[PDB]
From a paper:
We show that the orthologue identified in A. hydrophila (AhlABC) is a haemolytic tripartite α-PFT, requiring all three components for maximal lysis, and we present the structures of the soluble forms of monomeric AhlB and tetrameric AhlC and the decameric pore form of AhlB. AhlC provides the initial single leaflet insertion, assembly with AhlB then producing an oligomeric hydrophobic pore, and finally recruitment of AhlA produces a hydrophilic fully active AhlABC pore. Structural and sequence analysis suggests this method of pore assembly may well occur throughout the tripartite α-PFT family.
The structure of the soluble form of AhlB was determined to 2.3 Å resolution. AhlB folds into a compact five helical bundle structure (α1–α5), with an associated domain constructed from a mix of three alpha helices and three beta strands. Within this compact soluble structure, residues G191–A222, identified from hydropathy plots as a hydrophobic domain that possibly inserts into the membrane, fold into two antiparallel β-strands (β1 and β2; the β-tongue). These hydrophobic residues are thus shielded from solvent by packing against residues of helix α4 (E254–V270), α3a (residues V170–L186), α4a (residues G225–G239), the N-terminal helix (α1, residue G12–V34) and the C-terminus (residues T331–A359), which forms a short beta strand (β3) and helix (α5a). In this soluble structure of AhlB all non-Ala/Gly hydrophobic residues of the hydrophobic head are packed away in the core of the protein as the hydrophobic β-tongue. The hydrophobic β-tongue of AhlB is shielded from solvent by packing against α3a, α4a, the N-terminal helix and C-terminal helix of the tail domain in the soluble conformation. Comparison of the soluble and pore structures of AhlB shows that a major rearrangement of the protein occurs between them, in a similar way to that seen in the ClyA pore formation.
Residue numbers in the entry: 7 to 360
The structure:
């Protein structure tokens, strides 16, 4: 795997999980004070949610910065590489070459360590989310049995939501991935409720996993709304369609489906994180082989100079360009203002028809 794809994929996935985590943290705790036979159930829900907000926080506060630092190291690396054929003028001895390559390999290996450590901490996050996400599911089914509801209809909703959530995830990835590397590009995010929470009275909106992301320029917002609105509506349809499910249970299940959504974002992050480490490992081995071959009679400093100048003009200029535009996108990302009583699907529906 090339350094430009590993970087493009992790940047892309990070901006999506970032948004998702923001939606986790925005979720309000449930309110069942009306039915005192559910206090134990409320408590359970809200303790589970705080675990979900804990995982979200850990991602934004510990993992995201390392991802940002990684992107900056890719630039560090290639700028150091381009600089060597300038620091070592045409005479330069084999010794000089061995010292320079050995030094930049050291620096690169250190970047490999940051990236592999990151992969390891995302893996561990995911594993803890799988457990924490599976336990929440049981807190929902416990509540459902306590209101003598059908566990079978509940199950068919969870299954139906999981399939749609994957469609959403898919389209969002498509939007971000397709605009990520456009030189002037930016992104806007939208966080809203997965279901209507005002037509009937009791208002507990569920924004966890209720998300949308679009290109900020031109008619990017509209263009974005169009590919997103189908999948988003489909989900809202499933929570609004007539069902035997208690309302209190419908809330906890909405939350629970968002919780699941968080863990799938983590699993997507494992994938991207793995790809970026492998890109670093492939790079440190190539450097490793370059040193080894200079050390034998196979290559020379003059040959490496040649190889890194044609690289500096062709494949490196590309990478360094993308690194600039990627750091811009991630730092530039901006949130759309969503009306407090709106839904994410309705919001996007209306933006899609402008």
């Amino acid at each position: 795997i090339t350094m430009d794809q590993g970087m493009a994929n992790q940047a892309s996935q990070a901006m999506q999980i970032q948004t998702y985590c923001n939606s986790v943290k925005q979720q309000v705790p449930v309110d069942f004070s009306q039915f005192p036979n559910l206090k134990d159930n409320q408590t359970q829900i809200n303790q589970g949610l705080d675990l979900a907000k804990g995982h979200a926080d850990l991602y934004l506060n510990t993992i995201q910065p390392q991802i940002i630092t990684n992107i900056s190291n890719i630039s560090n690396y290639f700028a150091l590489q381009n600089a060597i054929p300038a620091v070592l003028p045409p005479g330069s001895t084999k010794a000089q070459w061995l010292r320079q390559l050995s030094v930049i390999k050291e620096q690169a290996t250190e970047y490999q360590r940051l990236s592999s450590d990151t992969r390891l901490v995302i893996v561990n996050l995911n594993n803890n989310l799988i457990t924490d996400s599976s336990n929440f599911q049981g807190i929902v089914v416990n509540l459902n049995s306590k209101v003598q509801g059908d566990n079978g209809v509940l199950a068919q909703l969870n299954g139906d939501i999981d399939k749609v959530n994957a469609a959403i995830d898919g389209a969002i990835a498509g939007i971000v991935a397709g605009g990520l590397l456009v030189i002037g590009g930016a992104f806007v995010t939208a966080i809203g409720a997965v279901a209507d929470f005002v037509t009937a009275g009791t208002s507990t909106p569920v924004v966890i996993g209720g998300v949308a992301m679009m290109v900020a320029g031109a008619g990017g917002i509209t263009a974005g709304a169009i590919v997103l609105h189908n999948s988003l509506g489909a989900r809202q349809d499933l929570y609004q369609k007539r069902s035997s499910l208690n309302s209190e249970v419908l809330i906890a299940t909405q939350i629970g489906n968002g919780y699941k959504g968080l863990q799938v974002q983590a699993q997507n992050a494992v994938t991207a994180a793995t790809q970026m480490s492998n890109a670093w490992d492939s790079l440190t081995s190539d450097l490793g082989s370059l040193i080894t071959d200079l050390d034998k009679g196979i290559t020379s400093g003059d040959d490496i100079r040649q190889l890194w100048l044609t690289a500096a003009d062709t494949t490196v200029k590309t990478v360094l360009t993308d690194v600039t535009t990627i750091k811009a996108q991630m730092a530039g990302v901006s949130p759309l203002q969503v009306p407090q009583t709106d839904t994410i699907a309705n919001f996007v529906a209306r933006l899609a028809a402008l």
